[PDB]
Amino acid sequence: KILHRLLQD
Amino acid sequence: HKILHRLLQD
Amino acid sequence: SLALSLTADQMVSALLDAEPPILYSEYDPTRPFSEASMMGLLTNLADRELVHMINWAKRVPGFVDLTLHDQVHLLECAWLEILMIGLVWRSMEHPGKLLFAPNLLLDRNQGKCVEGMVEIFDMLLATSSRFRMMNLQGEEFVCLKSIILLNSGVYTFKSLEEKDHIHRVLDKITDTLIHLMAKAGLTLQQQHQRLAQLLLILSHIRHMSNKGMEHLYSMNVVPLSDLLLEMLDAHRL
Amino acid sequence: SLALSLTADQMVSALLDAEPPILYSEYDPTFSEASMMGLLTNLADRELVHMINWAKRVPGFVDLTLHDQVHLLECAWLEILMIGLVWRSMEHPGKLLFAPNLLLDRNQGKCVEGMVEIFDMLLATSSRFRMMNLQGEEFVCLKSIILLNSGVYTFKDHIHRVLDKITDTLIHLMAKAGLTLQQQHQRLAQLLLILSHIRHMSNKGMEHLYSMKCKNVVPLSDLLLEMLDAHR
Ligand SMILES: Oc1ccc(C(=C2CCC[C@@H](c3ccccc3)C2)c2ccc(O)cc2)cc1
Ligand SMILES: Oc1ccc(C(=C2CCC[C@@H](c3ccccc3)C2)c2ccc(O)cc2)cc1
């Protein structure tokens, strides 16, 4: 999911 | 006369 | 209004003495489950509990001071919250199980007969396990349950301005909860922390209620007593 | 976890510093069902991007696994948007300040099915905050509490430690304001009970915000759609 990506950077 | 209303009214 | 003149100890005993009774289910263990039968038992159990809850609400301090339209609203708003916190409370000493009645003890496995029930079941179990870890007291519980009744529907109500009266009763119950924690030998830091922990639970009891309510007015699986229909339809709009 | 090691003042400043900016709505000063939801869903999607990065700055949130971070944010995102909306609408009685260039009363919003009811509850929340004279330092504590609490029993021991820490912070703020011992726990309770209503607004809002009928009124972003599906 997109939330996975947005939390890492 | 909701049932709730009557029961509260007793 | 007398409710404002109540001391903490007088508040506690009044709430304890007003406690509704634990009702039995019409459950025969010799005949296994259908979705309808399960809902049949649960709906049949809740509807009788509603009759007692209404009379319980009358004995809650400051509740009779409200107009009857306001009384109707607060109960319409909070009835499933109160049914659920009661359920969660008597299920404390039964880990992994929900004690709907002394003769009706169910785990999440048979919570799968009804579609959408296992989700609500798990949340109720978590709440119960939370009350277990906190060593929640009966006196604390009746305060909380009383807090749900007056608080849940205040901001869903022309110079009424006795929402202020409700708020001061709420404050008195807060004083009561603090009084109880001070008696349990808790420090001020511990008192405020436990107070917070208890009230945060209410947010999740609200959540469970709304999620549950959403599944309840989706039906036709067993027909609902006219009171349980009206309480239900109060949310469906 | 370092968050537990923080002092009350350290917690306050860290929360204030992490505060997301007040975003603007798409201008053009022209309201139908499609237009209203268009502006709202656009604003919400942009706010979500800021919220996610805000959450990473909430003391203790980083210590959680990626999965647990996702869960809490999926659970609380509409609650956090709403308490934000309620907060910045405080100095505008009878109106909701979605954006500085988007200030609405209850009459506008019956354009949208089910929006009026949620609208009134938001206005009631804002009126409650203003009559309590809610401070900024209190608001950031409450919003952080929502983040950690709302999804915590859908799982926790660490999170509860942090929750206790924020409670200590809230009490610390009230004692500094000059409140007596009785006034402190009374106000603490009053604030936390609002969270129950914020949860209620979110739940009732979500019920309308998913459902195919509302999904179809305007194309939603993939992100906003995934946050919605998490509650379905
Ligand atoms: O003391 C009680 C507390 C709650 C319930 C109950 C719950 C508790 C757990 C299961 C919940 C559920 C059931 C089906 C679908 C979704 C959620 C409702 C229920 C069931 C049927 C009704 O018409 C009203 C209330 C009964 C007694
Ligand atoms: O900062 C914001 C707070 C709330 C909203 C918003 C609200 C505003 C208040 C009323 C809510 C509503 C709308 C239609 C029917 C029922 C309730 C939606 C919304 C709209 C669409 C979404 O996908 C997510 C959030 C945006 C930003």
Query: Domain locations in chain C?
Result: 1-237
Residue spans of beta strands (DSSP E) within D145-224: none
- Note whether B7 contacts C51, CB cutoff 8 Å: yes
Identify the CATH assignment for C1-237 out of 1.10.565.10, 3.40.50.1100, 3.40.605.10, 1.10.260.30: 1.10.565.10
Resolution stated for this PDB structure, in Å: 2.2
Ligand nearest to the CA of C222: 1
Report the candidate in C13, C10, C14, C43 with the shortest Cα–Cα distance to residue C27.
C43
- Of D167, D195, D198, nearest to C192 by CB-CB distance is D167
**Can you give the three-state secondary structure of chain C, one letter per residue?**
CCCCCCCHHHHHHHHHHCCCCCCCCCCCCCCCCCHHHHHHHHHHHHHHHHHHHHHHHHCCCCCCCCCHHHHHHHHHHHHHHHHHHHHHHHCCCCCCCEEEECCEEECCCHHHCCCCHHHHHHHHHHHHHHHHHCCCCHHHHHHHHHHHHHHCCHHHCCCCCCHHHHHHHHHHHHHHHHHHHHHCCCCHHHHHHHHHHHHHHHHHHHHHHHHHHHHHCCCCCCCCCHHHHHHHHCCCC
Characterize D90-100 residue by residue with b for buried, 16 or more Cβ atoms within 10 angstroms of its Cβ, and e for exposed.
beeeeebbbbe
Interface of D with C (CB under 8 A): 117, 121, 124-125, 128, 145, 149-150, 153-155, 160, 163-164, 167-168, 170-171, 181-182, 184-186, 188-190, 192-193, 195-200, 203-204, 207
Rg (CA), chain B: 5
Q: Residue D178 C-alpha to ligand 1 middle, in angstroms?
A: 45
Ligand nearest to the CA of C119: 1
- CATH architecture designation of domain D1-232: Orthogonal Bundle (1.10)
Chains in contact with C via at least 3 Cβ–Cβ pairs below 8 Å: B, D
- List chain D residues with CB under 8 Å of C171: 186, 189-190
How far is the C-alpha of C173 from the C-alpha of C94, rounded, in Å? Answer: 28
How far is the C-alpha of C130 from the C-alpha of C178, rounded, in Å? Answer: 20
